[PDB]
Every structure is written in C-alpha cells, then in structure tokens.
Amino acid sequence: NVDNIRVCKILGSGISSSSVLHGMVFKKETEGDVTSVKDAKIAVYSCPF
C-alpha cells in the first residue's frame, strides 16, 4: 500500500539529516503532564474524552 508511507516535513537541518522512523510522528503536544512512556499501552477512542 502506497498510503502506508508517511512523509513528515520539519524545517531546519538540510535534507542530509533526514531519517526513517518505524512508526508515526505528529506535530502536536501532549494534553497532560506525562510526556514520555517506555512501555506504551495505547488505548484509542474515537469519542471525546
């Protein structure tokens, strides 16, 4: 599937610094105080929290 490849454009360091990540990147911020998880257990809700 072509759509399974995502491109994230972040300005600043020249194209030689590009890299591939096995996952996804969102240009956003966390809502709460926790900002890092090492054994993530994501629960996804389509409804408002």
């Binding site: 020249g14 194209i15 900002t35």
Partner: protein, 525 residues
C-alpha cells in the same frame, strides 16, 4: 509571436526563461541581502520597518527584518526561508546565511553569464559544502573534561559572543550570566515555555532581574482584594483550575420547585456549595490561591477574612511555570487537596514594578523554571532586548547539547576558505574555478565586519589571508584594536553547529536558485 486564435495558457501569464532569468534571480538575491548587510557584528546597526498599521518595529535580527519586508520575488523568498530555517534550527546566525547565499550567487554570476551549465555549479557547491562541513567538524575545539566551572565559562563566553551585536551589548556580561543561569535551571528538555519573559516599561537595563521562581502580573482583582495580606514567609500554594463564583450549576441545569421553603433551600444550597469549595480550599492549609478560571468577589472577601491570597484568571503558562517552580498540581477539583498537590515557596510577595503590580514567588530550591523581568524605556526597546535574549538562550541551549566551539569574527570562514582553495588547486580545473569562487565567497563575513566597523576591508583581509596561510587557525577581525587578533584567546566563541547549519542552508539555497531556468506566473485569482 504570432497570435494564435486560441491561446495555450490564460491571458496575462508571464513567463521568463533563459540565462537572463537566472541572472535576474541572482540580482534579486543580492537586493535582499543588501537589506540586512549592515546588521552584522558588534558595530552593526538596527533597522526600522513600519507596517501598514503604522506600528514600527526596530530589530538587529536578520530573520525578523526579512520577515517584516514583504518579499514577493519568488527567487528572493528563498533567502527569507533559509533565514527562517536558521532561526528555527539554531536561533543565531540568521544574517550570515543570507550574506553567504547571496555571495555564492554573486561569485557564480560571471560563469552563468558565459553559458556554464548550472548542474556543474550545483555539483561544485555540494562538494565544497561537504568538505567545509567536514573541516568544521574536524577542527572544532572541544574539551573532554566535564568540568563544571569550565562549562560555565564556555557558556558565558558563547552567550557574550551571541549578545555582542545588540543594543544590550554594553551589559552583555550581565545578561549572559542571567541567560546561563536560566538555561541551567531548566531540567532536561530545555523547553522555551519554561523561561518566562516579562517586559515592564521604565527603568534602566541594569534594573532587569532574573527571579529563581515565577512572577506574573496582577490579574483584575475584585473588591476586597486590598484587604488581603501581601507577604507570606512560608506559603503553601493551591494551584487550581476552578471557577470560584456563584453561578448556575450547569448551562443546561433547570430547577423546578413549587414551595417557598424549597426556594429558600435551593438558595442556601447554592451558597453552601460555594462555601464548601472555599472551606475545603481553606482547610487544605494553603495561604496563596491561584486559579486559571475566574475567582469572584465573594471568594475574594472570604479569603480576605482568612488572611489568604487569591488571584483569578491567571494565564495557563504562568500556572504551568508556578507548578514547575513550586511543585504542585493544577487541580480541577478541590475534593482531594492533599499536601503533595500543594505548591511551596519560601517567600511570596506583591511589589511595585514600574507602574505595575507583580506577584513574586521566590525561594524555590527545586525550581525548574525562571522568569525574566526586562526593564526599558520603550516598547520596542524591551522587544529587541527580548529578541537578543532569545538569541542568547538558543545559543546556550545548543551549546548545552554539545560543547563544540569555533572562534568567531570570520576566523573560521577564513580558515575554511584557505582549506577550500588548497583543495581546489589540486583538481582538473573545471571544478577548480567554481570551488575557488566558493572559497572567495566565504570571505564575505569578515569583509562585512570590516565594512560595518569602518575599517579598510582589503588590508584586514590581506592580513588575515597571510596569517592563515602562514599558520594560525583562530585569527579573526579585532574590531576595537583596528587590526586582527586570535579570536580564540579573545573569547569570541560560537557553537560549531551555527556555522554548519549556516553553510548547509546557504548552499542549499544557492543550488535551488541556480537549478531554476524558467519562472511562470499565472494571473492572480
């Protein structure tokens, strides 16, 4: 041009193609670079730009100036974009990028005029940039001792160098020490939102202070606020996200009663709800109460009767800074106000600061945030002080990330030009001209420093070239002494990543501009 009965593109489409188009692109790039040329080095000058609304802005920062000019030339916007990129990734050197890119284009303009294929020029730029970046990484000076005092001195010197081009350059040591302390107080992510910057009109630059805690302006106190004490010697702070007011229980809540005592009970129940919230807050043990949501007059008088402090409508960023400094949690409910969710600071005080009232939280020993209170005689004065402090903060953060420095004042670029010329002397000869042009274009920054300070650029450039060729790496422009000097022993230090990103962005912009052969402009919709 024969008028075809049916035209191909829309009427009014403008197309320019060929060598003249690229020559015009180069000329426009130099036009843009001229607008920021004189804002370089300690002897730089500020620019004043007035928008349509008539609100002027005064700045020495190249990226800011370029953003305020409304550039519409498509090739010229590349310089503005690379200035923005340099500001985003590094934060300093937003002028050197534009001068370097325009100088590259100017140096390769004569070869373009004589029909040289632009792919050759692009390849030469890529090779020269790679070699220069490798040389920068190789010759950058780093100390593998992890000495705390040495790290402090390195950061202070880098901040002083970053600050020695702005209107606050006379107090550059003071501001550099402040910025280094501020960056140290941040914990691990060096988030900019954890360094508050408050600008208060009136007062000297030396009146600016850094508070080891959090400070924010007084926020629309209600009646009975003046009856509250304004100094606490060991307060516990209740950080809240709560609207302490008499109000409807919910927007969609409706009350239906059919008896008078039920009416009285409902009124007393609303009052009891408000007093229950206030009583829980009071018995939490806190003395200072802050809320993101408004705090009404009834709650203000209630806290005044208890010798407590209240402040509603506090901005969210200020509440975050207070939580980071004091160590509590922003509670949306007051049902569990335990000791671990209450902030704690040594001294809380409200003081008069230049015609305004500010709440000060000082004495926090575990504070991970800080607030700058900048004093100045004008709005733009304090804005430019903030911009200079932002440059210094970004420089110090990047230096925290890695302690690699190269001497400033054009010494690094003279060394790079010498190395590139030595390399170019040993190649077949078609790329030799272009790499030599790249090395010559690398000489723009020391030349611009000499021009801005009023020297004779040619003599200083000749002396620098001779010094670099005969041996010596960190010899740059000495502005005060009218000569050249070793800029490493003069503590003109800048992080290597600044020049690395500057060269990379300038090379990319030059290659993108050169690679274009035709510009087509559709009619505006």
């Amino acid at each position: 041009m024969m008028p075809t009965p049916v035209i191909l593109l829309k009427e009014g489409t403008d197309s320019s193609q060929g060598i003249p188009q690229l020559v015009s692109n180069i000329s426009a790039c130099q036009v843009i670079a001229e607008a920021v040329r004189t804002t370089l080095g300690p002897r730089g000058m500020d620019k004043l730009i007035v928008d349509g609304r008539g609100k002027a802005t005064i700045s020495n920062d190249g990226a800011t100036i370029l953003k305020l000019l409304d550039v519409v030339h498509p090739a010229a916007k590349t310089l503005v974009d690379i200035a923005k990129s340099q500001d985003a990734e590094v934060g300093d050197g937003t002028t050197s990028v534009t001068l370097l890119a325009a100088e590259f284009l100017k140096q390769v303009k004569p070869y373009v005029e004589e029909g040289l294929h632009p792919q050759i020029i692009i390849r030469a730029f890529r090779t020269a940039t790679q070699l220069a970046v490798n040389k920068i990484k190789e010759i950058a000076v780093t100390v593998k001792k992890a000495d705390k005092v040495e790290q402090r001195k390195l950061l202070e010197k880098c901040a002083m160098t970053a600050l020695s081009s702005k209107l606050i350059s006379q107090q550059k040591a003071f501001f550099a020490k402040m910025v280094v302390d501020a960056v140290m107080m941040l914990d691990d992510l060096l988030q900019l939102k954890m360094i508050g910057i408050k600008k208060v009109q009136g007062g000297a630059l030396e009146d600016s202070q850094l508070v080891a805690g959090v400070a924010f302006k007084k926020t629309f106190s209600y009646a009975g606020f003046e009856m509250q004490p304004k100094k606490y010697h060991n307060p516990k702070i209740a950080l809240l996200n709560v609207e302490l007011e008499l109000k409807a229980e919910k927007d969609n809540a409706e009350i239906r009663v059919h008896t008078v005592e039920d009416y009285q009970a409902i009124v007393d129940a609303e009052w009891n709800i408000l007093y229950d919230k206030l009583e829980k807050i009071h018995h939490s043990g806190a003395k200072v109460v802050l809320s993101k949501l408004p705090i009404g007059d009834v709650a203000t008088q209630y806290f005044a009767d208890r010798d407590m402090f209240c402040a509603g409508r506090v901005p969210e960023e200020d509440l975050k800074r207070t939580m980071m400094a004091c160590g509590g949690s922003i509670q949306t409910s007051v049902n569990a106000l335990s000791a671990d969710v209450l902030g704690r600071c040594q001294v809380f005080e409200e003081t008069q600061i230049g015609g305004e009232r500010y709440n000060f939280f000082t004495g926090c020993p575990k504070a991970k945030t800080c607030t700058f209170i900048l004093r100045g005689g004008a709005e733009q004065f304090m804005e430019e002080t903030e911009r200079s402090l932002h440059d210094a903060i970004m420089i110090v953060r990047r230096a925290i990330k890695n302690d690699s420095v190269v001497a400033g004042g054009g010494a690094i670029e003279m060394e790079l030009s010498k190395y590139l010329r030595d390399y170019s002397r040993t190649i077949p000869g078609k790329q030799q001209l272009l790499i030599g042009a790249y090395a010559k274009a690398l000489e723009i920054i020391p030349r611009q420093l000499c021009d801005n300070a009023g020297f004779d650029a040619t003599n200083i450039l000749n002396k620098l070239r001779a010094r670099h060729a005969q041996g010596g790496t960190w010899y740059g422009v000495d502005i005060n002494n009218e000569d050249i000097a070793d800029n490493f022993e003069a503590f003109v230090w800048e992080p290597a990543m600044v020049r690395i990103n500057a060269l990379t962005a300038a090379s990319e912009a030059a290659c993108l501009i050169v690679s274009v052969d035709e510009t087509i402009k559709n009619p505006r919709s």
